[PDB]
Amino acid sequence: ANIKSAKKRAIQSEKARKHNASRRSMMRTFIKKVYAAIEAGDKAAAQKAFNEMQPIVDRQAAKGLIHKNKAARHKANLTAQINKLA
Amino acid sequence: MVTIRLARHGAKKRPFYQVVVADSRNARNGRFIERVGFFNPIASEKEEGTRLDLDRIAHWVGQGATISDRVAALIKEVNKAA
Amino acid sequence: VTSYIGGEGHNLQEHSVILIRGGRVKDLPGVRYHTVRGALDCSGVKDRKQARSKYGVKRPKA
Amino acid sequence: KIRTLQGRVVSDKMEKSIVVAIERFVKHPIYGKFIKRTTKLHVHDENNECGIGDVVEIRECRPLSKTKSWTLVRVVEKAV
Amino acid sequence: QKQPNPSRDWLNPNLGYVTTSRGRSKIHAWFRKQDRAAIGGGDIRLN
Amino acid sequence: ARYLGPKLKLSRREGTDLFLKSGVRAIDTKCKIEQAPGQHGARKPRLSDYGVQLREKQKVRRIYGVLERQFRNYYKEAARLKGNTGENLLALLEGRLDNVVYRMGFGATRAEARQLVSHKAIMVNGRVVNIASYQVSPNDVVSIREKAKKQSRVKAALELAEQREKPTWLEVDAGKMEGTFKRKPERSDLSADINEHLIVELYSK
RNA sequence: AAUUGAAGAGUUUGAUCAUGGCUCAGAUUGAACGCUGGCGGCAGGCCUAACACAUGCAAGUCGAACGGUAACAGGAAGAAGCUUGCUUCUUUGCUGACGAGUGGCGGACGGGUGAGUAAUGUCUGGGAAACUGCCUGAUGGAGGGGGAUAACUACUGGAAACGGUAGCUAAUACCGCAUAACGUCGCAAGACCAAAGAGGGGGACCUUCGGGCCUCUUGCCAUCGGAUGUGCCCAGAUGGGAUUAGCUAGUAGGUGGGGUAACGGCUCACCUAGGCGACGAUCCCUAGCUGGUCUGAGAGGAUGACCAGCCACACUGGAACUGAGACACGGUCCAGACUCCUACGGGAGGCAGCAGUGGGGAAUAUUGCACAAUGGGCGCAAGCCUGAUGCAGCCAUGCCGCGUGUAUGAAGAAGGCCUUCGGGUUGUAAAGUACUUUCAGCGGGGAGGAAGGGAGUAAAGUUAAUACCUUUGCUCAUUGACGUUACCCGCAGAAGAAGCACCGGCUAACUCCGUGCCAGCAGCCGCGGUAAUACGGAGGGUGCAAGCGUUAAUCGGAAUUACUGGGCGUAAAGCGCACGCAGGCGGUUUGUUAAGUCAGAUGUGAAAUCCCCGGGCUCAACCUGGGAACUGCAUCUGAUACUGGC
Ligand SMILES: [Mg+2]
Ligand SMILES: [Mg+2]
Ligand SMILES: [Mg+2]
Ligand SMILES: [Mg+2]
Ligand SMILES: [Mg+2]
Ligand SMILES: [Mg+2]
Ligand SMILES: [Mg+2]
Ligand SMILES: [Mg+2]
Ligand SMILES: [Mg+2]
Ligand SMILES: [Mg+2]
Ligand SMILES: [Mg+2]
Ligand SMILES: [Mg+2]
Ligand SMILES: [Mg+2]
Ligand SMILES: [Mg+2]
Ligand SMILES: [Mg+2]
Ligand SMILES: [Mg+2]
Ligand SMILES: [Mg+2]
Ligand SMILES: [Mg+2]
Ligand SMILES: [Mg+2]
Ligand SMILES: [Mg+2]
Ligand SMILES: [Mg+2]
Ligand SMILES: [Mg+2]
Ligand SMILES: [Mg+2]
């Protein structure tokens, strides 16, 4: 990085990246809980998982990490799956 | 953003601008959405020199178009002439 | 490729650079090129006053 | 009224997909002769309605598959 | 550079790259190296 | 840009009087106008069709003092314009400011006129014109500025003009040293020896 | 008013006509070389090595986002030699401001190059499943808590590059919680989702005298929009090769999952066995594509420098991250080859930005000045940055203009060359005489490109308020890189400003030597074997002219690939002859359809260019107004003779 700005951006990017990864990773984990529940065949549990995670997903979307559409999609798929289950 | 600006299409030492409606990011003389008129600072005292389709400009402004400072000045001048 | 040395006389010899321009000498079966006289190494022709441009001959002061 | 093309089926066997040869009658640019030109479009069809050798009216749409961006609206003259 | 690469343009004096004779000679030598009387030899053999 | 050399040689080559010398003293006495220029002038050449056309072209160019490229350009312009092409070309040639001046009678010869134009002697509509080729449009007045009115050369030119034939498309004043370009010169106004058609043909090969 | 345009020639022969090639005359260029060579204007300028790169600069900005002050200029409290009046040395962000930082926005534009790509390309036309910062229009929110973290400090690890611990602090950084629809999810009830404070001025209830409170200005956030931009799809068009005919398992399609901003074999699981293809798939070679450019009467052909649009790429090969947007020329990570530094442990680097250097090359410019404009970035601005851009330099590379004197001038001088020996030619050419001064030289004056911005004010718009802010007027001084600018004047005096090719035929222009089929010429035919208009010179001429030639390259001519526009008994050319799938074509009458066809309309075909009419540079080139044009495509509405379908 020859230009100060680039250097700043680079370090910022690194910092930003670390931040986002943590959030995104967490979100993924949350999703997996729901998915795991679905796989198991535990409906109440699945619902609980969804409840736990949906808000987080929404928050993430709001922040910008994940896109609004993407956030919606997870819910839809998850919603569909849970519905199917019971 | 979308902007109304002078595009310097002329000879050396003899500028002639088109008051074009271009995306700010595009080049000055390069791409544009619509050509709205022209302006000639050289011109001289004869008949014409500055001429802008004001209605189109207004429309663009309404939509959400940034008029350049020079362009704004030109517009003002035109208005006063009118 | 084989090339034709135009004009009378030359300073050409083996392992010497020259500028070639094309345009064949038709009575030589093989030659399709001409050496430009006055360019790079090959000197212009000695003592000519007409068509000098074609043989690299500088303009004599008179 | 949305756009639509008419042509005949070249093949059916792939489940919910029919291949349709649109025969356009373009003029040759240089020479001037009118030639028949083929456009083999892969077309989406629910319930496998068209068979092979049937004329079928088809409309453009969002790409259903890699190749398929057409969907049949009607069938016309199918028995052979 | 790490590799040796003299141009044949350096030998040509009209461009104005080498005024010295010695330098020119040296330059030439390189090309001959890269490349890698008969009558006399024959005579010698005969002798 | 101009022909710096023997004026009458060109005329001789052509055959006819090109008006390259004033006309105070006649062309037939000055040079051997009948004979072509050079050692082989008496040897009458059997001239080809292309050759004749070329000669014609030269004559016209010589008359106005228009070098080849310029002439070609003029021809092209004429072609682009509507009507008879040769006629148009002729008009354009005439329209040359220097030529116009000469016609009026401020240049004895066309060369003189050109020189005057160059030397900021001439004005068109109260504006100086350095350029000899300037196309003098209809209703454009042309004059000499007060600094160049006092020249004897101009007077001489005027006198010469008076002696000679008058153009119809021009108006001129001797005392004021100015005039008016009324309209574009027709084919009937100009000399009939100029076969413009030949010239046109030559710029179609 | 807007394509008003079309030439041949030489050469096969003893001669002819014909076929037929080669070939010249034209236009042209990003051209080069040769010989020259005054100037200007407008243009253009590494086509090859997408080869390597030293140096500088090419992207920074915002202190009105935030703690802070690394330099500086002012006050504030203290004191030194005390010129009786402050110079000076110490302290404190209190202020104008600002190093380094965090944050924001910008580094996705601008600029470059054309390596790759014959299609995740381009052009044209259609679309549907999308996102879209700033700008924008609308409708509602912006409450109340946190804990961090650089910066800064001590002790330290490293040659450096860069760290590492332990502490400290803020924010429009970050995160919960509340609040929560016009949002997201869903059949609903419901569940769930956000933020942002900052700057200028101020009456009084007030005040931990910071500020609360009011106000304006800006910023935040959600949602729907708008515009703009980007992604995606399909049709057709967009090179050559079949001496490349078979190709392809995520392959073609499906159900479901996953993924994407979005649809999609985009990817995975399982199933069906397809899909493409001689209307050329596949493989190979070459190639950015388009507007256009050149050429051409056109139709075409060639072509794609410059300018403009679209694509692709950034030392090679990857990969993601950040973000509205990139899988990012001057960001990150890795590997590679290659240069540099290193204390040998490890680092740094990426001109196809602008200059520049080397190299390659036939060949393509200066490490120039400037932000004065136009545009871009940031900011509330002032402003700062801007190798975009504007200008400047160099090169006749092009185009255009201008000049290089004008008029006169027989002794037809001299000299030159020829020479029937008279002259006749150079040639009115020169000299002489008169006259003029373009540009160049000197000295002077002297616009336009400059519109904005800054202070004071007065009014109106906001509000508790005549403050502040915004809007509109006005005077005041201002803002030029180019710049001894364009442009005008005066001075002296033709002074300083012509050369290149050609001259047998084609092909405009001819005489005179040496030699001797030698030397040389040459585009083709052909010249040269002792009297050469063809070779070299001289004169004389002809062509062009600051250029001229040569060479290369394209179209033209070449109707010589013929669509327009050719042929095939004998010149090249009828399969040896049949049958025959695909294809092409298809007698005749009525109906119908409207695909072709025709007509009209609508949208589009970017702008520039081309073309026409104009306008502006002294004219021109150049610029430029408006038009026409873009012969195309799509949709809609009709026509139904002809062609097609039924
Ligand atoms: Mg799904
Ligand atoms: Mg070289
Ligand atoms: Mg010229
Ligand atoms: Mg030179
Ligand atoms: Mg700062
Ligand atoms: Mg925030
Ligand atoms: Mg699926
Ligand atoms: Mg390539
Ligand atoms: Mg033709
Ligand atoms: Mg890459
Ligand atoms: Mg992202
Ligand atoms: Mg770079
Ligand atoms: Mg004599
Ligand atoms: Mg001057
Ligand atoms: Mg002749
Ligand atoms: Mg010759
Ligand atoms: Mg042809
Ligand atoms: Mg034939
Ligand atoms: Mg035969
Ligand atoms: Mg037969
Ligand atoms: Mg004019
Ligand atoms: Mg257009
Ligand atoms: Mg019928």
Coordinates of C-alpha atoms (C1' of nucleotides) in Angstrom, one line a residue, chain G residues 30-466:
Chain G
rG30 C1' -0.9 6.5 -36.4
rA31 C1' 3.1 5.5 -41.5
rA32 C1' 8.6 5.0 -42.1
rC33 C1' 13.3 5.9 -45.1
rG34 C1' 15.7 9.2 -48.7
rC35 C1' 16.7 14.4 -50.5
rU36 C1' 15.6 18.6 -48.8
rG37 C1' 13.2 22.3 -45.4
rG38 C1' 10.3 29.7 -43.5
rC39 C1' 6.4 30.5 -40.8
rG40 C1' 1.7 29.9 -38.7
rG41 C1' -3.2 27.5 -37.3
rC42 C1' -5.9 23.2 -36.3
rA43 C1' -4.9 18.2 -35.6
rG44 C1' -1.8 13.7 -34.7
rG45 C1' 2.4 11.2 -32.5
rC46 C1' 5.5 3.0 -29.6
rC47 C1' 1.1 0.1 -34.8
rU48 C1' 6.6 -3.7 -32.7
rA49 C1' 8.3 -6.1 -26.5
rA50 C1' 0.8 -7.0 -22.5
rC51 C1' 9.4 -6.6 -22.5
rA52 C1' 12.3 -4.8 -18.1
rC53 C1' 12.0 -0.8 -15.2
rA54 C1' 16.0 3.9 -11.5
rU55 C1' 13.6 9.1 -10.2
rG56 C1' 9.6 12.3 -9.3
rC57 C1' 4.7 13.1 -9.3
rA58 C1' -0.7 10.2 -11.0
rA59 C1' -5.9 10.4 -4.6
rG60 C1' -6.7 12.3 -1.4
rU61 C1' -9.7 14.8 1.7
rC62 C1' -12.9 16.0 6.0
rG63 C1' -10.9 19.4 13.0
rA64 C1' -18.4 21.5 11.6
rA65 C1' -17.3 12.9 13.2
rC66 C1' -13.8 12.1 17.7
rG67 C1' -10.1 12.2 22.0
rG68 C1' -5.7 15.1 21.1
rU69 C1' -1.9 18.6 20.2
rA70 C1' 4.0 16.7 16.8
rA71 C1' 5.1 22.0 14.5
rC72 C1' 3.2 27.4 14.4
rA73 C1' 0.6 32.3 15.5
rG74 C1' -2.3 34.8 19.3
rG75 C1' -4.0 35.8 23.7
rA76 C1' -4.0 34.2 29.3
rA77 C1' -0.8 33.3 34.9
rG78 C1' 4.4 33.7 36.5
rA79 C1' 9.2 35.9 36.3
rA80 C1' 14.5 37.7 34.0
rG81 C1' 19.2 42.4 31.6
rC82 C1' 14.5 46.0 33.7
rU83 C1' 15.3 51.4 27.1
rU84 C1' 9.4 53.1 32.5
rG85 C1' 7.5 49.4 28.3
rC86 C1' 7.3 45.8 26.6
rU87 C1' 10.9 42.8 23.6
rU88 C1' 11.9 37.8 26.3
rC89 C1' 11.9 32.7 28.8
rU90 C1' 8.3 29.1 31.5
rU91 C1' 3.4 26.9 31.8
rU92 C1' -2.3 25.8 30.0
rG93 C1' -6.0 23.2 23.2
rC94 C1' -8.5 28.7 25.7
rU95 C1' -8.5 30.0 20.2
rG96 C1' -6.8 30.3 14.3
rA97 C1' -5.4 25.8 12.9
rC98 C1' -3.0 20.9 12.3
rG99 C1' 1.6 16.2 12.6
rA100 C1' 0.3 11.2 13.7
rG101 C1' -4.2 8.5 14.8
rU102 C1' -9.4 6.5 15.2
rG103 C1' -14.0 7.6 12.0
rG104 C1' -16.5 9.1 7.3
rC105 C1' -16.4 9.5 2.3
rG106 C1' -13.4 8.8 -1.7
rG107 C1' -9.1 5.0 -3.4
rA108 C1' -15.0 0.6 -8.1
rC109 C1' -14.3 7.5 -10.8
rG110 C1' -10.7 9.7 -13.6
rG111 C1' -6.4 7.7 -16.8
rG112 C1' -4.0 3.4 -19.4
rU113 C1' -3.5 -0.8 -22.7
rG114 C1' -5.9 -4.4 -26.3
rA115 C1' -2.7 -9.5 -23.7
rG116 C1' -7.1 -12.7 -23.4
rU117 C1' -12.0 -13.3 -25.4
rA118 C1' -15.1 -15.6 -31.6
rA119 C1' -18.7 -15.4 -26.8
rU120 C1' -20.5 -14.9 -18.0
rG121 C1' -17.9 -10.5 -25.2
rU122 C1' -19.8 -6.4 -28.7
rC123 C1' -24.0 -4.4 -31.8
rU124 C1' -29.3 -4.2 -32.4
rG125 C1' -33.7 -5.4 -30.4
rG126 C1' -36.6 -7.3 -26.7
rG127 C1' -37.2 -8.8 -21.6
rA128 C1' -37.7 -10.4 -15.9
rA129 C1' -36.2 -12.6 -11.1
rA130 C1' -32.7 -8.1 -9.2
rC131 C1' -29.4 -4.7 -6.1
rU132 C1' -28.2 0.6 -6.4
rG133 C1' -23.5 5.3 -2.0
rC134 C1' -23.8 10.3 -2.7
rC135 C1' -28.2 13.4 -5.4
rU136 C1' -33.3 13.1 -4.9
rG137 C1' -39.4 13.2 -3.5
rA138 C1' -42.4 11.4 0.2
rU139 C1' -43.9 9.4 4.9
rG140 C1' -42.4 8.3 10.3
rG141 C1' -38.6 7.9 13.8
rA142 C1' -33.8 9.6 16.2
rG143 C1' -35.2 7.2 23.6
rG144 C1' -32.1 5.3 27.1
rG145 C1' -27.5 2.2 28.6
rG146 C1' -23.1 0.1 27.8
rG147 C1' -18.1 -2.2 27.3
rA148 C1' -14.0 -1.7 24.0
rU149 C1' -10.3 0.4 21.0
rA150 C1' -6.3 2.9 18.6
rA151 C1' -4.0 7.7 19.7
rC152 C1' -0.9 8.7 24.2
rU153 C1' 2.9 6.4 28.5
rA154 C1' 6.5 2.9 30.7
rC155 C1' 9.5 -1.8 30.1
rU156 C1' 11.0 -4.3 26.0
rG157 C1' 11.7 -8.1 20.6
rG158 C1' 13.5 -7.0 16.0
rA159 C1' 19.0 -4.5 11.1
rA160 C1' 14.9 -2.9 9.1
rA161 C1' 9.9 -4.2 7.7
rC162 C1' 7.3 -4.1 11.6
rG163 C1' 6.2 -5.2 16.5
rG164 C1' 4.9 -7.1 21.9
rU165 C1' 3.1 -6.8 26.6
rA166 C1' 0.7 -3.7 30.8
rG167 C1' -2.0 0.7 31.3
rC168 C1' -5.3 5.2 29.8
rU169 C1' -9.5 7.8 26.4
rA170 C1' -13.2 9.5 22.9
rA171 C1' -16.3 9.4 19.1
rU172 C1' -21.7 10.0 13.6
rA173 C1' -16.5 3.9 15.6
rC174 C1' -19.0 -0.8 18.0
rC175 C1' -22.8 -3.2 20.5
rG176 C1' -27.2 -4.5 23.3
rC177 C1' -32.1 -3.0 25.4
rA178 C1' -36.5 0.0 24.5
rU179 C1' -39.5 1.9 20.8
rA180 C1' -41.5 -0.9 15.4
rA181 C1' -44.8 0.1 10.8
rC182 C1' -45.8 1.9 5.0
rG183 C1' -40.8 -3.3 6.6
rU184 C1' -39.2 -8.8 6.9
rC185 C1' -41.4 -13.7 7.9
rG186 C1' -46.0 -15.9 7.4
rC187 C1' -52.8 -18.2 5.9
rA188 C1' -53.2 -15.0 10.3
rA189 C1' -52.9 -13.9 15.4
rG190 C1' -48.3 -12.9 16.2
rA191 C1' -42.7 -13.0 16.0
rC192 C1' -38.7 -9.8 14.5
rC193 C1' -35.7 -5.8 12.8
rA194 C1' -32.8 1.1 13.3
rA195 C1' -30.3 5.2 14.4
rA196 C1' -26.5 9.9 15.5
rG197 C1' -25.1 13.1 17.1
rA198 C1' -22.6 17.6 15.2
rG199 C1' -22.1 23.2 13.9
rG200 C1' -23.9 28.7 14.2
rG201 C1' -26.8 32.7 17.5
rG202 C1' -29.9 33.5 21.5
rG203 C1' -34.8 36.5 25.7
rA204 C1' -36.5 34.2 30.4
rC205 C1' -38.6 29.6 34.3
rC206 C1' -33.0 27.7 34.8
rU207 C1' -27.6 26.7 35.7
rU208 C1' -22.8 20.9 39.2
rC209 C1' -22.2 28.5 35.0
rG210 C1' -19.7 22.7 30.7
rG211 C1' -24.7 23.4 29.2
rG212 C1' -30.3 22.4 29.8
rC213 C1' -34.3 25.2 26.7
rC214 C1' -35.3 27.6 22.0
rU215 C1' -33.9 28.1 17.4
rC216 C1' -31.8 27.5 12.4
rU217 C1' -28.2 24.3 9.4
rU218 C1' -26.6 19.8 8.4
rG219 C1' -26.0 14.6 9.4
rC220 C1' -28.3 9.6 11.1
rC221 C1' -32.0 5.7 10.5
rA222 C1' -36.5 2.9 8.4
rU223 C1' -39.9 2.4 4.3
rC224 C1' -41.8 3.3 -0.4
rG225 C1' -40.4 5.9 -4.6
rG226 C1' -37.3 8.6 -8.5
rA227 C1' -33.2 9.0 -11.2
rU228 C1' -28.5 6.9 -12.2
rG229 C1' -25.4 3.0 -12.3
rU230 C1' -24.5 -2.2 -12.2
rG231 C1' -25.8 -7.6 -12.4
rC232 C1' -29.0 -11.4 -15.3
rC233 C1' -31.7 -13.6 -19.4
rC234 C1' -33.4 -14.5 -24.8
rA235 C1' -33.4 -13.6 -30.2
rG236 C1' -30.9 -12.3 -34.1
rA237 C1' -26.5 -10.2 -36.0
rU238 C1' -21.1 -10.1 -35.0
rG239 C1' -13.9 -13.8 -38.5
rG240 C1' -11.2 -17.9 -41.3
rG241 C1' -10.6 -23.3 -41.5
rA242 C1' -14.5 -29.6 -42.3
rU243 C1' -7.1 -31.5 -45.1
rU244 C1' -11.1 -29.8 -37.6
rA245 C1' -17.8 -34.5 -37.8
rG246 C1' -18.9 -36.0 -34.1
rC247 C1' -19.1 -33.6 -29.3
rU248 C1' -20.6 -33.3 -24.0
rA249 C1' -21.9 -36.7 -17.0
rG250 C1' -22.9 -31.3 -14.1
rU251 C1' -23.1 -33.0 -19.6
rA252 C1' -29.5 -31.9 -21.1
rG253 C1' -33.8 -31.9 -18.2
rG254 C1' -36.2 -32.9 -13.7
rU255 C1' -37.7 -33.0 -7.6
rG256 C1' -35.8 -31.2 -3.3
rG257 C1' -32.0 -28.9 -0.5
rG258 C1' -28.0 -25.1 -0.4
rG259 C1' -26.4 -20.5 -2.5
rU260 C1' -27.0 -15.5 -4.9
rA261 C1' -28.8 -8.7 -4.4
rA262 C1' -31.3 -11.4 -8.3
rC263 C1' -33.1 -16.0 -12.2
rG264 C1' -30.3 -19.6 -13.3
rG265 C1' -26.4 -26.8 -12.9
rC266 C1' -24.8 -21.3 -9.9
rU267 C1' -23.5 -25.9 -6.4
rC268 C1' -25.0 -30.6 -3.9
rA269 C1' -28.2 -35.0 -3.2
rC270 C1' -31.4 -38.6 -5.9
rC271 C1' -33.9 -39.7 -10.6
rU272 C1' -35.0 -39.5 -16.2
rA273 C1' -31.2 -39.9 -20.6
rG274 C1' -30.8 -36.5 -22.8
rG275 C1' -28.7 -31.6 -25.2
rC276 C1' -25.6 -29.6 -29.2
rG277 C1' -24.6 -30.7 -34.7
rA278 C1' -23.2 -30.4 -41.8
rC279 C1' -29.0 -23.6 -40.9
rG280 C1' -21.2 -26.2 -39.0
rA281 C1' -21.6 -28.5 -32.8
rU282 C1' -16.5 -29.8 -31.8
rC283 C1' -11.4 -28.8 -32.4
rC284 C1' -7.7 -25.6 -34.5
rC285 C1' -5.9 -20.6 -36.2
rU286 C1' -6.6 -15.4 -35.9
rA287 C1' -9.3 -11.4 -33.4
rG288 C1' -11.3 -6.7 -28.6
rC289 C1' -16.2 -5.4 -30.5
rU290 C1' -19.3 -0.9 -32.1
rG291 C1' -20.2 4.2 -33.4
rG292 C1' -17.1 4.9 -37.2
rU293 C1' -12.5 5.4 -40.7
rC294 C1' -10.6 4.8 -45.6
rU295 C1' -12.2 3.4 -50.4
rG296 C1' -16.0 2.9 -53.6
rA297 C1' -21.0 5.7 -58.4
rG298 C1' -23.3 2.5 -55.5
rA299 C1' -23.5 -2.4 -53.8
rG300 C1' -19.5 -3.8 -51.6
rG301 C1' -14.3 -4.5 -49.8
rA302 C1' -10.7 -3.3 -46.4
rU303 C1' -10.4 -1.5 -41.7
rG304 C1' -11.2 -0.2 -36.2
rA305 C1' -4.8 4.8 -34.3
rC306 C1' -7.2 9.6 -32.6
rC307 C1' -12.5 11.2 -30.5
rA308 C1' -17.1 8.6 -28.2
rG309 C1' -19.9 3.8 -26.3
rC310 C1' -19.6 -1.1 -24.7
rC311 C1' -16.2 -5.3 -23.1
rA312 C1' -11.7 -7.3 -21.2
rC313 C1' -7.0 -7.0 -18.6
rA314 C1' -3.4 -4.5 -14.6
rC315 C1' 4.4 -8.3 -13.3
rU316 C1' 2.0 -14.2 -14.2
rG317 C1' -1.5 -17.6 -11.7
rG318 C1' -5.1 -17.6 -8.1
rA319 C1' -8.3 -16.2 -3.9
rA320 C1' -11.3 -13.8 -1.2
rC321 C1' -12.0 -9.3 2.2
rU322 C1' -13.9 -4.5 2.7
rG323 C1' -17.9 -2.0 0.3
rA324 C1' -23.7 0.8 -2.4
rG325 C1' -20.4 -0.8 -6.1
rA326 C1' -14.5 -4.6 -6.9
rC327 C1' -13.3 -10.2 -6.7
rA328 C1' -10.1 -3.5 -6.8
rC329 C1' -3.7 -0.5 -12.2
rG330 C1' -1.0 3.2 -7.8
rG331 C1' -5.9 -2.0 -1.7
rU332 C1' -5.4 -7.3 1.1
rC333 C1' -3.8 -12.7 1.2
rC334 C1' -1.0 -16.8 -1.1
rA335 C1' 2.2 -19.0 -4.8
rG336 C1' 5.5 -18.1 -9.1
rA337 C1' 9.2 -15.9 -12.1
rC338 C1' 11.8 -11.4 -12.1
rU339 C1' 14.6 -6.5 -9.8
rC340 C1' 16.1 -4.1 -5.0
rC341 C1' 17.2 -3.8 0.3
rU342 C1' 19.0 -6.8 4.4
rA343 C1' 22.9 -7.1 10.4
rC344 C1' 21.0 -13.4 6.0
rG345 C1' 16.6 -14.0 10.4
rG346 C1' 13.5 -11.7 6.7
rG347 C1' 11.6 -7.8 3.9
rA348 C1' 10.2 -4.4 -0.4
rG349 C1' 8.4 -3.9 -5.1
rG350 C1' 5.0 -4.0 -9.6
rC351 C1' 4.6 2.8 -15.4
rA352 C1' -0.6 -1.4 -20.1
rG353 C1' -1.3 6.6 -14.9
rC354 C1' 2.0 11.2 -16.7
rA355 C1' 6.9 12.4 -17.8
rG356 C1' 11.2 9.4 -18.4
rU357 C1' 15.2 5.3 -19.1
rG358 C1' 16.9 1.0 -21.3
rG359 C1' 15.4 -2.8 -24.8
rG360 C1' 12.9 -4.4 -29.1
rG361 C1' 12.0 -1.6 -33.7
rA362 C1' 11.8 1.0 -40.2
rA363 C1' 9.4 4.3 -36.7
rU364 C1' 6.3 7.6 -32.7
rA365 C1' 7.7 13.5 -28.3
rU366 C1' 9.6 16.6 -22.5
rU367 C1' 11.6 13.5 -16.0
rG368 C1' 7.5 21.3 -18.7
rC369 C1' 4.0 24.7 -16.0
rA370 C1' -0.9 25.0 -14.0
rC371 C1' -5.2 24.1 -11.4
rA372 C1' -6.9 30.2 -14.4
rA373 C1' -11.1 27.1 -16.8
rU374 C1' -14.0 22.6 -17.6
rG375 C1' -14.8 18.1 -14.8
rG376 C1' -13.8 14.8 -10.3
rG377 C1' -12.8 13.9 -5.1
rC378 C1' -13.7 15.5 0.0
rG379 C1' -15.9 19.4 3.0
rC380 C1' -20.9 23.7 5.7
rA381 C1' -17.5 26.2 3.6
rA382 C1' -12.7 28.5 2.8
rG383 C1' -9.7 25.2 0.9
rC384 C1' -6.4 21.0 -0.4
rC385 C1' -5.5 17.1 -3.8
rU386 C1' -6.3 16.1 -9.2
rG387 C1' 0.2 14.0 -14.9
rA388 C1' -8.3 14.1 -15.7
rU389 C1' -8.0 18.4 -18.0
rG390 C1' -6.0 22.9 -19.7
rC391 C1' -2.0 24.7 -21.8
rA392 C1' 3.1 24.7 -22.9
rG393 C1' 7.8 21.9 -25.3
rC394 C1' 9.7 18.4 -29.4
rC395 C1' 8.8 15.8 -34.5
rA396 C1' 6.6 18.8 -41.9
rU397 C1' 3.5 13.0 -39.4
rG398 C1' -1.2 15.0 -41.6
rC399 C1' -4.7 18.6 -43.1
rC400 C1' -5.4 23.8 -44.1
rG401 C1' -3.6 28.8 -44.7
rC402 C1' 0.1 32.2 -45.7
rG403 C1' 4.6 33.7 -47.5
rU404 C1' 9.1 33.4 -50.1
rG405 C1' 8.3 39.9 -53.3
rU406 C1' 4.7 43.2 -56.8
rA407 C1' 4.9 46.3 -61.4
rU408 C1' 8.2 47.5 -64.9
rG409 C1' 12.2 46.2 -67.6
rA410 C1' 15.9 44.5 -75.0
rA411 C1' 21.5 45.6 -74.6
rG412 C1' 16.7 40.2 -76.1
rA413 C1' 23.2 42.1 -71.8
rA414 C1' 26.9 38.7 -69.8
rG415 C1' 27.6 33.7 -68.5
rG416 C1' 25.3 28.8 -69.1
rC417 C1' 23.5 25.1 -73.0
rC418 C1' 22.4 23.7 -77.6
rU419 C1' 24.0 25.2 -83.0
rU420 C1' 21.5 24.0 -90.0
rC421 C1' 26.8 28.6 -87.2
rG422 C1' 22.7 32.8 -88.9
rG423 C1' 21.3 32.5 -83.7
rG424 C1' 17.7 30.6 -79.9
rU425 C1' 17.3 29.1 -75.6
rU426 C1' 17.7 30.4 -70.5
rG427 C1' 14.2 34.8 -70.9
rU428 C1' 11.3 39.9 -68.9
rA429 C1' 14.4 35.6 -66.6
rA430 C1' 18.5 38.7 -64.1
rA431 C1' 20.7 43.5 -63.4
rG432 C1' 18.7 48.5 -63.3
rU433 C1' 14.1 51.6 -61.9
rA434 C1' 9.7 52.3 -59.2
rC435 C1' 6.4 50.3 -55.3
rU436 C1' 4.9 47.3 -51.2
rU437 C1' 6.2 45.0 -46.1
rU438 C1' 2.9 38.9 -45.3
rC439 C1' 5.7 36.5 -41.7
rA440 C1' 10.4 37.0 -39.5
rG441 C1' 13.4 41.4 -36.1
rC442 C1' 13.0 45.5 -32.7
rG443 C1' 9.8 48.9 -29.5
rG444 C1' 5.1 49.9 -27.8
rG445 C1' 0.3 49.0 -26.8
rG446 C1' -3.4 45.1 -25.9
rA447 C1' -8.8 42.0 -25.6
rG448 C1' -11.1 37.1 -24.6
rG449 C1' -11.0 32.7 -22.4
rA450 C1' -13.5 34.9 -15.5
rA451 C1' -18.0 32.6 -14.4
rG452 C1' -17.6 32.1 -9.5
rG453 C1' -15.6 33.1 -4.5
rG454 C1' -14.7 37.1 -0.2
rA455 C1' -16.3 41.2 2.9
rG456 C1' -19.9 44.9 4.2
rU457 C1' -24.9 45.9 3.8
rA458 C1' -30.7 46.3 2.7
rA459 C1' -34.9 43.3 1.9
rA460 C1' -37.5 38.6 2.0
rG461 C1' -37.8 33.3 4.0
rU462 C1' -37.2 30.6 9.1
rU463 C1' -38.4 31.3 14.7
rA464 C1' -40.0 33.4 21.0
rA465 C1' -36.7 37.2 18.4
rU466 C1' -34.9 43.1 14.0

